[PDB]
């Protein structure tokens, strides 16, 4: 049994049939040790007496909030959550396994530049009694730098039968001295609590690997007098990190085989939808969304 | 499963005595043992849990102790309502298992059975079968041996016994043996008798009947 | 319009193509996305190789370039002196490593993978462009053939990441 | 005011299905887990298993796994135990109980549901006299209630006038699959002829009521 928040404890137990429960002793957050009594959830029934309450925890029926009383009015409480270890592995019921990259990819990440700001997002079919918490850091070093906001709702992409719900979070690394290269992976830790069930997820990554740039800025044309050679030029996205020379980009110019990749910020094609993506010059990160234009 | 073994399988005590049942587990069960009390046709009442803790409501006079493997139950000063059979239960590892029980019979002075033997009804014979029944009445202990003897001949796998639950007022038992035969095999004999042995009898008392009596 | 970019780009390309060879001919080996840098606290190339624009000031030694190197340097002689010195010092380390490993790969009777000479050359073609005079040592341990084939994937990966940061600097200088 | 109230005694033939219930009240139904227990004729208690009122988190004793089915319709606060094919061996008393949280034992008990599985069909009993012999005092007598199904059956004397001295024995399962008991009385030999004696037999499972008078001869 360990402590999550103050007055919130998690106990872990394995699901092999002939396995025991845990004998936990609940102490009351009080000075006086006289006539107090215990209760569970919303029931009024006394479980026992004493500043201390020894119990066994074997099932979700033993979880929930134990409250000690005295003189009718409430004294303090102890919530208990269960972390379920099925057989070596821990439970992963609440977050869906979007087996896109490798497998067991429960929480995903993207960054629109090399600033340190990134956004993570997980998926879940559950829609009630949910409570998350995100923490992060690069390496065992500086516990600070990386700070995270609050997980929020973001989508509702309904699917056959059960409806899907997407949650996202925003994070910001802030190194007292920025490095020219990442030697250790950024690490994300999500605590997921669904009713009485506790679980925690983790993902490690390099920013250099989870980069998606905003689409190319603004495009133009130039057929000139009467010759029909559609000339296309754009500009580096506003969010992209600067100096654009130290942080080169690359592009893919498409249309409606014939695909043309290029580095420079301008090119010309042949006339007949038009569009152009953008990718980190150095690494095979993610292509940006498309930017269309008339034929 | 974890084997729960109570002892004694039974005992007898008087009102106001200090009595103690024991219980023991085939393994370790920490302090996860509960005690229940049950009476004849009634459901079980929950008395003690966590080995030594009284469930909200049960009398002061109860108590339990032990941890790991050997647990007990004790009544400081016994009383009438406390007469029943008692079960322990291990609630540490699935499946939770009980003891086979420990009956508490009242302790009272030895008493011999009044014996009676009953002829079949003329109404039943003209139906096909015959039931000769023998009644040992009000005695103690319920330890009694009943043997039928038709024409001095012993009978086996032919009778059916049945005994009551210690009378609530005179603290006594009473049983009925029932030998049953077809009309045919019945007519084929004269001396029907059941001989009753019991520690309250200085010698086997036998009640019989031939086929007369007006 | 800049000499070093030319070699920097040739290097990034050469390692990118050698890395691809390894993880395309080395299957029964852990060569999939494990990540180590041999120039850890040895070289301050990581600390100070970001543009002068981001290094707002020296909030966070061996500064002396060599006449005849690369000069779109109205900005390279600058604070980056600690960067070029170090970078070169990086190439000197990765140099002995690949050199050593290639020695082994050549002896291995199970002719599995070979170190592309072209990539060994562009690491030299780069240090004789940076010039730089330096005195430095190679303690360590020696592997077998299989062991060495492992330490390869690790280096080719770490090295591309390094080569990239190199190109970043050379791309930066060329423009300012 | 915690109360587990179970459904009434049932009787079935081997192979029939059956679902028994137990409505709870006087307590927060969703806080406490519910469990079932069997008790075979004159035996101990078999822990069948345990389960949750809200979510379908059940815990069967390996011996009952796949033999029975636990359920709970929390909207009416009622737990269910169920069979699809009863065997003779299944006949027993079935208690449902409440599992005290943070411990695992049973807080409170249902009053039981008697379940009888036999290939016997329902039948009223035959009542026969057990006439007093000759003790010219204190004599015995009674009615022999034989060949009926199922239990229970009730037996009084003189419409309930006579009690002090009555010994109605526990019934006995005959090899024929039918039950049989005996109910006797101890009286003084001096009342034979004066105030007659009649045993009142009542077997509800078939409307049958029989009143046999017992006399000497
Ligand atoms: C994501 O999920 C996993 C699994 O749930 C979490 O891992 C648990 O994290 C907690 C962190 O506190 C661990 O609990 C700690 O265990 C410590 C050591 O374990 C032993 O303790 C004694 C030894 O004498 C025995 O009971 C036994 O040998 C245990 O293995 C304890 O020391 C901690 O207790 C207290 O110690 C310090 C003393 O300085 C006190 O100040 C604190 O009160 C502290 O709590 C504590 O109980 C737990 O062991 C982990 N589980 C396992 C199996 O690894 C992750 O932490 C979680 N991710 C997060 C952090 O969100």
PDB file of C-alpha atoms and ligand atoms in Angstrom, chain A residues 1-4 10 12 83 90 135 189 191 198 200, ligand 1:
ATOM      1  CA  UNK A   1       0.000   0.000   0.000  1.00  0.00           C
ATOM      2  CA  UNK A   2       1.399   3.368  -1.085  1.00  0.00           C
ATOM      3  CA  UNK A   3       0.225   6.966  -1.238  1.00  0.00           C
ATOM      4  CA  UNK A   4      -0.955   8.674  -4.420  1.00  0.00           C
ATOM      5  CA  UNK A  10      -3.250   2.499  -3.880  1.00  0.00           C
ATOM      6  CA  UNK A  12      -1.760  -3.664  -5.681  1.00  0.00           C
ATOM      7  CA  UNK A  83      -3.952  -1.502  -9.041  1.00  0.00           C
ATOM      8  CA  UNK A  90      -0.648  -4.577 -14.916  1.00  0.00           C
ATOM      9  CA  UNK A 135       3.966  14.459 -15.124  1.00  0.00           C
ATOM     10  CA  UNK A 189       3.649   9.578 -16.997  1.00  0.00           C
ATOM     11  CA  UNK A 191      -2.040   8.338 -13.754  1.00  0.00           C
ATOM     12  CA  UNK A 198      -6.064   2.862 -10.693  1.00  0.00           C
ATOM     13  CA  UNK A 200      -0.536   4.391 -14.817  1.00  0.00           C
TER      14      UNK A 200
HETATM   15  C1  LIG E   1       2.873   3.384 -11.540  1.00  0.00           C
HETATM   16  O1  LIG E   1       2.557   2.083 -11.077  1.00  0.00           O
HETATM   17  C2  LIG E   1       3.504   1.395 -10.276  1.00  0.00           C
HETATM   18  C3  LIG E   1       2.832   0.141  -9.732  1.00  0.00           C
HETATM   19  O2  LIG E   1       1.688   0.531  -9.013  1.00  0.00           O
HETATM   20  C4  LIG E   1       3.996   2.251  -9.117  1.00  0.00           C
HETATM   21  O3  LIG E   1       5.005   1.587  -8.376  1.00  0.00           O
HETATM   22  C5  LIG E   1       4.803   1.704  -6.950  1.00  0.00           C
HETATM   23  O4  LIG E   1       5.249   2.956  -6.473  1.00  0.00           O
HETATM   24  C6  LIG E   1       5.326   3.187  -5.080  1.00  0.00           C
HETATM   25  C7  LIG E   1       6.121   4.474  -4.880  1.00  0.00           C
HETATM   26  O5  LIG E   1       6.133   4.812  -3.514  1.00  0.00           O
HETATM   27  C8  LIG E   1       6.026   2.077  -4.309  1.00  0.00           C
HETATM   28  O6  LIG E   1       5.769   2.149  -2.920  1.00  0.00           O
HETATM   29  C9  LIG E   1       6.906   2.373  -2.240  1.00  0.00           C
HETATM   30  O7  LIG E   1       7.411   1.114  -2.026  1.00  0.00           O
HETATM   31  C10 LIG E   1       8.622   1.361  -1.292  1.00  0.00           C
HETATM   32  C11 LIG E   1       9.544   0.126  -1.260  1.00  0.00           C
HETATM   33  O8  LIG E   1       8.990  -1.163  -1.372  1.00  0.00           O
HETATM   34  C12 LIG E   1       9.145  -2.059  -0.215  1.00  0.00           C
HETATM   35  O9  LIG E   1       8.908  -1.577   1.145  1.00  0.00           O
HETATM   36  C13 LIG E   1       9.088  -2.480   2.267  1.00  0.00           C
HETATM   37  C14 LIG E   1      10.595  -2.869   2.580  1.00  0.00           C
HETATM   38  O10 LIG E   1      11.112  -2.861   3.911  1.00  0.00           O
HETATM   39  C15 LIG E   1       8.160  -3.699   2.012  1.00  0.00           C
HETATM   40  O11 LIG E   1       6.775  -3.394   2.227  1.00  0.00           O
HETATM   41  C16 LIG E   1       8.589  -4.326   0.636  1.00  0.00           C
HETATM   42  O12 LIG E   1       9.971  -4.807   0.709  1.00  0.00           O
HETATM   43  C17 LIG E   1       8.398  -3.367  -0.562  1.00  0.00           C
HETATM   44  O13 LIG E   1       8.864  -3.836  -1.856  1.00  0.00           O
HETATM   45  C18 LIG E   1       8.409   2.001   0.100  1.00  0.00           C
HETATM   46  O14 LIG E   1       9.560   2.282   0.821  1.00  0.00           O
HETATM   47  C19 LIG E   1       7.627   3.270  -0.008  1.00  0.00           C
HETATM   48  O15 LIG E   1       7.160   3.611   1.272  1.00  0.00           O
HETATM   49  C20 LIG E   1       7.570   4.782   1.953  1.00  0.00           C
HETATM   50  O16 LIG E   1       8.955   4.908   2.215  1.00  0.00           O
HETATM   51  C21 LIG E   1       9.388   6.244   2.432  1.00  0.00           C
HETATM   52  C22 LIG E   1      10.634   6.200   3.321  1.00  0.00           C
HETATM   53  O17 LIG E   1      11.487   7.291   3.054  1.00  0.00           O
HETATM   54  C23 LIG E   1       8.278   7.115   3.032  1.00  0.00           C
HETATM   55  O18 LIG E   1       8.750   8.424   3.261  1.00  0.00           O
HETATM   56  C24 LIG E   1       7.071   7.181   2.099  1.00  0.00           C
HETATM   57  O19 LIG E   1       5.885   7.173   2.864  1.00  0.00           O
HETATM   58  C25 LIG E   1       7.099   5.989   1.151  1.00  0.00           C
HETATM   59  O20 LIG E   1       5.801   5.770   0.651  1.00  0.00           O
HETATM   60  C26 LIG E   1       6.458   2.964  -0.943  1.00  0.00           C
HETATM   61  O21 LIG E   1       5.410   2.136  -0.418  1.00  0.00           O
HETATM   62  C27 LIG E   1       5.596   0.694  -4.750  1.00  0.00           C
HETATM   63  O22 LIG E   1       6.530  -0.207  -4.209  1.00  0.00           O
HETATM   64  C28 LIG E   1       5.552   0.557  -6.268  1.00  0.00           C
HETATM   65  N1  LIG E   1       5.055  -0.741  -6.676  1.00  0.00           N
HETATM   66  C29 LIG E   1       5.897  -1.619  -7.227  1.00  0.00           C
HETATM   67  C30 LIG E   1       5.538  -3.071  -7.116  1.00  0.00           C
HETATM   68  O23 LIG E   1       6.939  -1.288  -7.801  1.00  0.00           O
HETATM   69  C31 LIG E   1       4.552   3.539  -9.699  1.00  0.00           C
HETATM   70  O24 LIG E   1       5.117   4.357  -8.697  1.00  0.00           O
HETATM   71  C32 LIG E   1       3.452   4.276 -10.446  1.00  0.00           C
HETATM   72  N2  LIG E   1       3.957   5.524 -10.998  1.00  0.00           N
HETATM   73  C33 LIG E   1       3.756   6.705 -10.406  1.00  0.00           C
HETATM   74  C34 LIG E   1       4.810   7.146  -9.431  1.00  0.00           C
HETATM   75  O25 LIG E   1       2.778   7.428 -10.624  1.00  0.00           O
END
